[PDB]
Symmetry: T
Subunit: 135 residues, 12 copies
């Protein structure tokens, strides 16, 4: 049943129109409809994100990860994610390919099962649906 | 109602386990469930793909495009796609970021609404669901 | 008398304000005024473009070529053009140097007699005038 | 017995001193001497080349491929060739390493069994002899 | 009526077969035929070229510029040219794309209306004709 | 009659299944069948390889060269080879294009008549056959 | 009145001759003389820096930021800073252009109002004076 | 007392809202308030700029330099500036890091004491204040 | 006597066969045998690592550092390490040169006394022995 | 018992304060203490180094290799080393990462078990201790 | 008899121990001893340097050129020098290869007969001696 | 009195019009005229070249070195040359800047006193004259 949705730096600033609280609500509802339980967490702290990924590795739970700016910069986060035995879906709200060049490289994409970008907050819900149809 | 799903070179070879015919069947069924009509087309010919994209531009219809190898190589296809006024969702079955470096660059991604990779054939169905919730 | 004007992919979409049909009309008129006969052809198919270039090589006729996106991508088209014994003038309607970086490289320019960009549809007429004053 | 020899764009222009027709004759004769049957095909159309490669994959037949300019540019052709279970020998008539830098990169060489360049039309005959001694 | 034609370093050396004096004569004649007045100036001094460009910016007059080697090297000249409100047409006599790699980059092309290269001295006359048909 | 076959560093380690001694035997036999005399030499010493190439230049004899790792690294060997007036055929047993990136560059290929890679030890025999049909 | 001065990693080590405490004293005094109130904060924690930047965005207050090593590495910090509606002045004590190449790139400079480097601790005081004369 | 403020090409065009004459006035006033004497000079001529820098080197006077486009292009200007024994402060009015990539490289910054960009004309006044507090 | 051994992100995950607790035990034992006292610390938090490095700089104690993914990414950690007056030995358990290209660059190696990679956990013990023989 | 220590070009010049003879003495003593027999060899000749590596491959003996300048340049040496079935430890006396950029790339490191740099001559002794604890 | 020695920007600053006046004296004396007449000129103005090179081209006289910083930056100077029919010897006083990377590229060296660097002022005298022995 | 002139690979092939023997004769004569004794040596063996450089380092004698292809490739030769306390003059007969790009980089030039290229065999004689006037 359990899927971890992990949001990295600055994702707490959503809607400052959907807020991060609203995003959690939307995800929890969709997960329930799909027969899943979503655990949604957000932090601006890389160490905190690492701890959540370590917990998902120890529990063999899937992860939907939007690492924010750390997507483009953190080898440490990639290394934690490499431990995951269940699926890892990378999600970005914006189309990172339509922006600055530095955003078009991800340390996570090569080790992710798959990647959804540019579909807004619905990307998280689509990632949930992938996991529901593959469990 | 209408969404065009356009598959480029080599996509006719799927399952030679899901075949291209089965993919069409799956897409048509999901579209029907979502209240859409999917028109699925495949060609190994760039000129044929261009014609289908031109038709979607003239009709102001959305496109889900898996251009195959042309993703990485064709400016002509990007230019045709730039004419689309409705959404363009790029889909790849494989995780192109986990493969050769040349596959990590797309001429289409910068002009697409969004991009789904690595989620298998379900990526097309998720793209349909995005379009259904945004119409 | 004879000059071949060859337009590549997407050039049939002009004005969808001058249409491709209007462009042909303008070119034919100017050619007539210059004492030339312009044969204007357009295709989205690389193979078709190659055939037209092969015919111009066999006839030792000049070519004004706007290869569209193939300018930036096709070695095959460059190789066909390398056979031309008469002048080859590359024309682009837009200023390809004021756009994306990938548009600033042409496989054709090194083998062309010369290149006109950014002067709109008048570029074709200026190319005709070059050929008229050099015949 | 059967070996497919596939020639890409511009190879029909040979000798416009050996013509493409003469090349076919030479190949068929050598194949016969080696106890093989050579099926020689040429097209300026990438889609046509893809279809021939798909047929060789379905038949588990070897391919001697001179893709012309598509060697340097086509991921789609590489992807079709990756399906071949029998040997793939890349042949170029000219020494592509003694020419422009862009000719020194091939999308096909990494997936080919081997590569012969610069030995003229005899390269095809040597490729046939490799296949005859390895069958 | 007025068009400024500005030639940069080494252009005074033309024909040392058309000389720079002959070029001025040819341009003035063509301008007269087109109903324009051409003011042709040449200098080996970047500061002098800048002053002429500043004058054209203050007068809102078009410029046909062949900056010679400064095309490839001068940000200062680009910055002066960015002030022009009327059209800027870059002209090179030689096909700069058929020469050394450093000649294939221009600081001016991205801010020019358009660019003519490789058409010899006729390039200036064609630039005049563009300006005459667009005034 | 005489063809020099020169093997560079590590080629003495073949089969430590064909050994270098067996390779010499195979080459000598094929040469005899073709009406040639093959002189096969191997050294791990660049200076020794240079001396053999100098001798072939002084005698105007062809060379089949597999320089081993020096292919990718030695300008001195390229310079010696540039003196050869008779054909130079570069041979590699492995497909150097299917390996590390550094193996895809050769200092020798631009000055070779042609290049055979990935066809195993038969590559040497095919090179002999090229030389026999071109003498 | 309020300006936030935010110092990143290692800036607490100043003078271990001006210490970080002395820097705060100097800044507070200058701000008072200029009719401003400076709030000076330092952390080695990226998450803490992000929180301070988020607070300045919510309050529409200017920021003088010396992000230390994060200048060169953190997309997350750039993204937080992109939310600021008031001016952002980047300050470095050392001349980062006179040091290692990696220090000559900043993720912050493109989104900053301006940048002062190499003027020592006086750079902060000059940034304050800019803000005082622009309020 | 004496500080040289040297402006390079195109800086005479300021306000064609602060004009170069107004800039001189503002600088002279601020210098007077700081107990300095500012000597402000502008030229579009690199040779003239070099002469002014040579004079400042011979007099051991500080320089505030805004070299305009020569910042990005002139080794000669860097070499003249390397002779200065007193401080060299590079100033740019615009934020050169928020513009084209070529503007993000300066030949002067590595040899300058420090660099101020993007603070408008106030940058010169802040540079003066640095020099006043360090004399 | 005192040596600080500092482990960065993900090193707490060792053996999830040697665990991080076992590593501490092994290091403490070897240090004791060498007449040293090892203080072993691990954190996933860059700020925490910085604090430990600052303490070692203030105490003039040597450091054996395995920064994990921060090796490849953190300028802040390099800057903290640059303050160390005693030796800094970089250790990696895996051979970072046999892995992805991004792992072959370290911000720490240029400022380290030396570097041990690929020798497993014994690398830490060898680093201790270096420090014991150099004290 | 047997470990081969192989030193490449210029290592005979050590101390011209530890000489190469002293290095051999130190290594032999440490090996004896560890229950190993060290065979230490040095040559300025790549061919000689290759022969020693071939002997170690045939004997399945470990190698501690300091290839000197050949580390950065020789594919032939890498290829010989790839044959080793026992461990290969690369040692450099100097910290090659603190020097010129060309020294930061090694053809050997990717195929080595591990690498020790910058620990002086003690690096060889530490490599011996690794081999003793892993036999 | 006549050789032109042309010095570019900043060369007038020599000895501010040999001065530029002393350099002229030394050159004139050596030229006289060699049976040549040296005409030595220096300017900080690119236009002036171009004029001197144009005069040498018109007179078919050799040139010894030390272009100072323009060596690395000026295509215009290269283009003027390309007109010279007599020898062009590039001289630099300093060893430009032992300095910043940007100094290791010269626009002039590819078109020069030869190049002398790092031999101090004697380089000019050696260039004279080359010209004397080749006239 | 003593100067070592060391020629690397392929230099024994000179005139196969001046031969290497003639070059030795010319050098010895010029050295005698200058009051020097030239010891001229040539080898195709890097190890032999290293030994000669080691001897010159031990004797504190100057070296004129034309390393042939090793100029562009050998770090080992650079490292031997770095030991020289007397001057090192690099000489190339050809203008290496007018040839292939790989020839425009030298491992030796940064550590040489100076470099002469493109002046033919006279370059060695000019190098001798530099050493004579600086002893
Ligand atoms: O941090 C990010 C950027 O650094 C990434 O390049 C893209 C990114 O992760 C994404 O689009 O999902 C984004 C999160 C992101 C996207 C939109 C908003 S609105 C307020 C915050 C916020 C954060
Ligand atoms: O052509 C492609 C590659 O050139 C792309 O890089 C990726 C790609 O478009 C995708 O994964 O969707 C793929 C289609 C693709 C993927 C799997 C199969 S199995 C038989 C055909 C086929 C085609
Ligand atoms: O295909 C192209 C682009 O791929 C090229 O980079 C530039 C190009 O060839 C040119 O500007 O002439 C252009 C044709 C081009 C330009 C404008 C229009 S409006 C409808 C079609 C169309 C096509
Ligand atoms: O198209 C090609 C070029 O684009 C490739 O770079 C090399 C190439 O495939 C090869 O040499 O075999 C060549 C075919 C080629 C070579 C010689 C001739 S003469 C008339 C046509 C033709 C085609
Ligand atoms: O200076 C130039 C070169 O630096 C540019 O790369 C190209 C260029 O501007 C052009 O071809 O118009 C050329 C002018 C150019 C072209 C031909 C001649 S013959 C005597 C002078 C001269 C100058
Ligand atoms: O040295 C080489 C490599 O350095 C080259 O990149 C490729 C190469 O020359 C080739 O494949 O012919 C190879 C010889 C080579 C190939 C196979 C074997 S098995 C024992 C030795 C050996 C040597
Ligand atoms: O961290 C930094 C470097 O990583 C940056 O490249 C430059 C930098 O931010 C700056 O010069 O302001 C510097 C702060 C910096 C500068 C000097 C000192 S002395 C003790 C600490 C410290 C920190
Ligand atoms: O020449 C320049 C550009 O080439 C530099 O990249 C930036 C630059 O020096 C700066 O911003 O100070 C600028 C001067 C500059 C800035 C604004 C204006 S408005 C009329 C002239 C002018 C000149
Ligand atoms: O984080 C790291 C990678 O990011 C580094 O590139 C290499 C690295 O520091 C090293 O090999 O020591 C590694 C620590 C590393 C190595 C093996 C394991 S098993 C569970 C954790 C873990 C951590
Ligand atoms: O040749 C080398 C350089 O080319 C390598 O880049 C580094 C290197 O192998 C190492 O430091 O071990 C060094 C050997 C080296 C190091 C120090 C000295 S003192 C006299 C000789 C010598 C040789
Ligand atoms: O301008 C130059 C630099 O820009 C070049 O990179 C090298 C250069 O041309 C050379 O060394 O000859 C030098 C002239 C040079 C060399 C030494 C001095 S001392 C006072 C002036 C001056 C000028
Ligand atoms: O080996 C070399 C090339 O590899 C270098 O790039 C340049 C080089 O050292 C030089 O020109 O002095 C040359 C020696 C060189 C130059 C001319 C001839 S004619 C017969 C041999 C030979 C060798």
């Amino acid at each position: 049943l359990i899927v971890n949705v992990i949001n990295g730096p600055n994702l707490g600033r959503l809607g400052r129109g959907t807020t991060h609280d609203e995003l959690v609500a939307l995800i929890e509802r969709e997960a329930a409809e799909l027969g899943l339980k979503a655990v949604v967490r957000q932090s601006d702290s890389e160490a905190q994100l690492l701890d959540w990924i370590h917990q998902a590795a120890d529990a063999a739970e899937p992860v939907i990860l939007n690492a924010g700016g750390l997507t483009h910069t953190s080898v440490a986060l990639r290394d934690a994610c490499a431990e995951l035995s269940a699926p890892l879906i990378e999600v970005h709200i914006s189309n990172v390919h339509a922006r600055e060049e530095f955003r078009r490289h991800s340390y996570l994409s090569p080790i992710a099962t798959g990647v959804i970008v540019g579909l807004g907050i619905q990307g998280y819900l689509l990632a949930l649906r992938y996991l529901a149809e593959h469990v």
